[PDB]
Design an enzyme around this catalytic site. Structure first.
Site, PDB file in Angstrom:
ATOM      1  N   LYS A  32       0.811  -1.207   0.000  1.00  0.00           N
ATOM      2  CA  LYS A  32       0.000   0.000   0.000  1.00  0.00           C
ATOM      3  C   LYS A  32       0.852   1.267   0.000  1.00  0.00           C
ATOM      4  CE  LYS A  32      -2.473   0.824   3.630  1.00  0.00           C
ATOM      5  NZ  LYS A  32      -3.437   0.211   4.598  1.00  0.00           N
ATOM      6  N   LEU A  76       3.111   1.906  -2.113  1.00  0.00           N
ATOM      7  CA  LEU A  76       3.394   2.300  -3.483  1.00  0.00           C
ATOM      8  C   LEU A  76       2.217   3.080  -4.057  1.00  0.00           C
ATOM      9  CD1 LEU A  76       4.741  -1.193  -4.591  1.00  0.00           C
ATOM     10  CD2 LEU A  76       6.130   0.841  -4.177  1.00  0.00           C
ATOM     11  N   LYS A 126      -6.388  -7.525  -1.013  1.00  0.00           N
ATOM     12  CA  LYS A 126      -6.295  -8.642  -1.945  1.00  0.00           C
ATOM     13  C   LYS A 126      -4.911  -9.260  -1.906  1.00  0.00           C
ATOM     14  CE  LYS A 126     -10.041  -7.539  -5.091  1.00  0.00           C
ATOM     15  NZ  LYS A 126     -10.621  -6.437  -4.263  1.00  0.00           N
ATOM     16  N   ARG A 181       3.938 -15.289 -29.243  1.00  0.00           N
ATOM     17  CA  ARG A 181       4.884 -14.179 -29.257  1.00  0.00           C
ATOM     18  C   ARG A 181       5.843 -14.352 -30.428  1.00  0.00           C
ATOM     19  NH1 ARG A 181       4.282 -10.097 -25.581  1.00  0.00           N
ATOM     20  NH2 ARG A 181       6.562  -9.807 -25.694  1.00  0.00           N
ATOM     21  N   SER A 209       7.743  -2.718 -28.370  1.00  0.00           N
ATOM     22  CA  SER A 209       8.642  -3.473 -27.498  1.00  0.00           C
ATOM     23  C   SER A 209       9.954  -3.822 -28.194  1.00  0.00           C
ATOM     24  CB  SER A 209       7.947  -4.743 -27.009  1.00  0.00           C
ATOM     25  OG  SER A 209       7.560  -5.567 -28.105  1.00  0.00           O
ATOM     26  N   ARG A 212      12.237  -1.081 -27.454  1.00  0.00           N
ATOM     27  CA  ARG A 212      12.602  -1.165 -26.044  1.00  0.00           C
ATOM     28  C   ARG A 212      13.523  -2.345 -25.719  1.00  0.00           C
ATOM     29  NH1 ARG A 212       6.995  -0.756 -25.419  1.00  0.00           N
ATOM     30  NH2 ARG A 212       7.077  -2.690 -24.161  1.00  0.00           N
TER      31      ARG A 212
END
Ligand code: B7P
Ligand code: CA
Ligand code: CA
Ligand code: CL
Ligand code: CL
Ligand code: CL
Ligand code: CL
Ligand code: NA
Ligand code: NA
Length: 326
Positions: free
Chosen positions: A51, A53, A63, A140, A171, A174
């Site tokens: 919590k 963050l 949860k 992928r 991506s 990246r």
DNA sequence: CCGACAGCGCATCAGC
DNA sequence: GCTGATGCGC
DNA sequence: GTCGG
């Protein structure tokens, strides 16, 4: 994958909220929480630690506590047992079927892959292509194949007009070892924010890639965005490569840097950066960064000579593409 | 508490 | 036909 | 679902 269990959980919750509840802000809330937890560099021991963050609040903290205590989430356990939610969730995996179409199909008794095939007459063109290659689009793409696809796209574009510049983004830019699909940023000097000096600049590129049988299907196509299907060529006796999604975006040449910042992503990274831009009094899209005046109305494009200028304007230190994987 | 949550291209539809 | 809203996807 | 002011 220090906290893979937790981020998987939140992602499944986000998918639920988006696909079944049609609660897009809960979906974005869960995705932001999953993103901030995925970059947290420790194994989370409690929800109270989580919590702390930003974007993890009280509900998600609890949860996480349940998940840590038991290894699972009752609320997800229930969602997984509900036939209708699971069906709606499944059908949205077909490209072109979103939450509305998925619920409409399920309400008509179209609940399975077989049901979609049997009822292909009820799909629009995008959905029919999404169904045709459903299995392939699940896979992928290894970076080695991305490199071959890059080679084909860049060379075919050079053959059309050597003044085009094609850049592979997403991506791949990246530095990912595998990509979900291929994103190609295209520019040409005859297309700027000032004028379009030539017609069909994207059409010609798409046409050339169809001619050499690289592009195999079209999901949607306009003057600046192409969304379709491509496939590497295979050798004698070789199993065919899977078909791949390809997106091509023709951007005004003088707006290249905003375009490549957008198309490099990630989507969450773009959302953080654009939100931060708002806080700093700017708005960023794939064309421009503009200031917001007192009324919060976009002014004139600010000068941009680099990706770093955009970062400089909102007082972010520069992050190289590889560090934008949020 | 409560507005605000990134930004936009293309396909499709209702209404004209 | 166009315009605006909605669905969808990036 | 989260949170800044
Ligand atoms: O909502 C969005 N916003 C948004 O700016 N973009 C931008 C950022 C994203 O990198 C780029 C391409 O989208 P992908 O869906 O291809 O995303 P990748 O990051 O390339 O990952 P993958 O390896 O292909 O899975 O468009 C995507 C969105 F979806
Ligand atoms: Ca991609
Ligand atoms: Ca893509
Ligand atoms: Cl919502
Ligand atoms: Cl679970
Ligand atoms: Cl630019
Ligand atoms: Cl703009
Ligand atoms: Na928090
Ligand atoms: Na879908």
């Amino acid at each position: 994958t220090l906290n893979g269990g937790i981020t998987d959980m939140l992602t499944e919750l986000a998918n639920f909220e988006k696909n079944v509840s049609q609660a897009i802000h809960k979906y974005n809330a869960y995705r932001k929480a999953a993103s901030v937890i995925a970059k947290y560099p420790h194994k989370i021991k409690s929800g109270a630690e989580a919590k702390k963050l930003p974007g993890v609040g009280t509900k998600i903290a609890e949860k996480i506590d349940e998940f840590l205590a038991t290894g699972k989430l009752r609320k997800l356990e229930k969602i997984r047992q509900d036939d209708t939610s699971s069906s709606i969730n499944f059908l949205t995996r077909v490209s072109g079927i979103g939450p509305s179409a998925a619920r409409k199909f399920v309400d008509e008794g179209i609940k399975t892959l077989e049901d979609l095939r049997k009822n292909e007459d009820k799909l629009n063109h995008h959905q029919r292509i999404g169904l045709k290659y459903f299995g392939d689009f699940e896979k992928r793409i290894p970076r080695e194949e991305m490199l071959q696809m890059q080679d084909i796209v860049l060379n075919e574009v050079k053959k059309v007009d050597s003044e085009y510049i094609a850049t592979v983004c997403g991506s791949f830019r990246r530095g990912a070892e595998s990509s979900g699909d291929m994103d190609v940023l295209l520019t040409h000097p005859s297309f700027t924010s000032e004028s379009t000096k030539q017609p069909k600049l994207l059409h010609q590129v798409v046409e050339q890639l169809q001619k050499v049988h690289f592009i195999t299907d079209t999901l949607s196509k306009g003057e600046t965005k192409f969304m379709g299907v491509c496939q590497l060529p295979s050798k004698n006796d070789e199993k065919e490569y899977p078909h791949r999604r390809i997106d091509i975006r023709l951007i005004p040449k003088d707006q290249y840097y905003c375009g490549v910042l957008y198309f490099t992503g990630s989507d969450i990274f773009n959302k953080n950066m654009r939100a931060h831009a708002l806080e700093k009094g700017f708005t960023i899209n794939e064309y421009t960064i503009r200031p917001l005046g007192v009324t919060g109305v976009a002014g004139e494009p600010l000068p941009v000579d680099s990706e770093k200028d955009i970062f400089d304007y909102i007082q972010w230190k520069y992050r190289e593409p590889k560090d934008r994987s949020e």
